Design a protein around this ligand. Structure first.
Ligand SMILES: *C/C=C(C)/C=C/C=C(C)/C=C/C1=C(C)CCCC1(C)C
Length: 240
C-alpha cells in the first residue's frame, strides 16, 4: 500500500486501541451514580457495548495494518469483504444509542441497521446493473430506518430536555446533542462516499476514500463513545 494509506491505518489503529483501553478502564473503575457498587457495569452489560465496539473496530484496523504490510489478503472478513466490520459494529452503536436514551424499538432499530448493512455488503459484491438495484433497495430501507430513528431520537431528546435543569445535566445534554449530531450527520457521509467512489461516479481515488473512511470511523466511534459516556455518568436520571 501507499505511505499515506499505511500511515492512516496505523494512526487509526492506535487511536481506536487507546480509546478502547481508556473506555474499558473507566467502565471497570466506574462505581455507579452512588459510588458504592463495585461491579455497577458488570450487572449492566449494555454500558460495556461501546467498549466492545471499539475493541472490534481496533481488531479490524489491526488486520488492515497487517494487510498494509503484506501482498496477500489478511483476515478476509475484516479486510476483503467491505462493510462486514460495519455489519458487526453499527448495529451495536444504534442499540447503545437507543439504550442510553431508553428509546423504544432499540432491538428493531439495530436489526434494521444490520439489514441495511447486509444489503450494502451484497451491493458491494454485486455486478452492475444489479448493483444499482441493490443500492436502490438499500437506499429505500436506510431512508425509512433513518426517518424512524430520527423521530425516536428527537422525541427522547425533547423528553430529556424537558426535565434537565442542573448545570451538570445541561453539560451532559450538550454532550448528548454532540453525540446525536455525530451519529446522524456523519452516517449520511458513508452513502455519499460510496456514491462518489470508483463505483458509480468515479471521482475520488481509492486512497482518499480509505482515509476519509478511517477519519469518519475514528470520529464517530472514539468521540461518539466518549460523549455517550460523559452523558451516561454525568446525567442524573432520577430527575425524570
Ligand atoms: C463505525 C462505522 C459506522 C457507523 C458505519 C456506518 C455505515 C453506514 C450507515 C452505511 C450506509 C450505507 C448506505 C445507507 C447505502 C449503501 C452504502 C452504505 C453501506 C455506505
Amino acid at each position: 500500500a501507499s505511505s499515506a494509506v499505511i500511515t492512516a491505518n496505523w494512526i487509526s489503529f492506535l487511536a481506536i486501541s487507546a480509546s478502547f483501553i481508556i473506555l474499558l478502564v473507566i467502565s471497570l473503575r466506574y462505581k455507579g451514580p452512588g459510588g458504592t457498587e463495585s461491579f455497577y457495569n458488570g450487572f449492566k452489560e449494555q454500558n460495556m457495548l461501546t467498549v466492545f465496539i471499539n475493541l472490534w473496530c481496533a481488531l479490524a484496523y489491526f488486520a488492515k495494518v497487517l494487510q498494509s504490510h503484506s501482498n496477500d489478503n489478511g483476515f478476509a472478513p475484516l479486510t476483503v469483504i467491505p462493510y462486514v466490520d460495519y455489519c458487526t459494529t453499527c448495529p451495536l452503536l444504534t442499540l447503545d444509542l437507543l439504550w442510553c436514551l431508553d428509546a423504544p424499538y432499540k432491538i428493531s432499530s439495530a436489526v434494521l441497521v444490520f439489514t441495511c448493512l447486509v444489503i450494502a455488503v451484497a451491493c458491494s459484491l454485486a455486478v452492475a446493473p444489479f448493483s444499482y438495484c441493490w443500492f436502490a433497495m438499500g437506499m429505500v430501507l436506510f431512508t425509512f430506518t433513518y426517518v424512524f430513528i430520527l423521530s425516536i431520537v428527537r422525541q427522547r431528546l425533547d423528553f430529556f430536555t424537558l426535565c434537565a435543569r442542573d448545570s451538570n445535566a445541561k453539560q451532559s445534554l450538550k454532550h448528548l446533542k454532540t453525540a446525536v449530531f455525530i451519529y446522524f450527520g456523519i452516517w449520511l457521509l458513508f452513502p455519499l462516499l460510496w456514491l462518489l467512489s470508483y463505483r458509480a461516479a468515479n471521482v475520488i481515488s481509492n486512497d482518499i476514500n480509505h482515509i476519509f473512511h478511517c477519519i469518519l470511523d475514528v470520529i464517530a466511534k472514539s468521540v461518539y463513545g466518549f460523549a455517550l459516556l460523559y452523558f451516561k455518568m454525568y446525567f442524573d436520571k432520577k430527575l425524570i
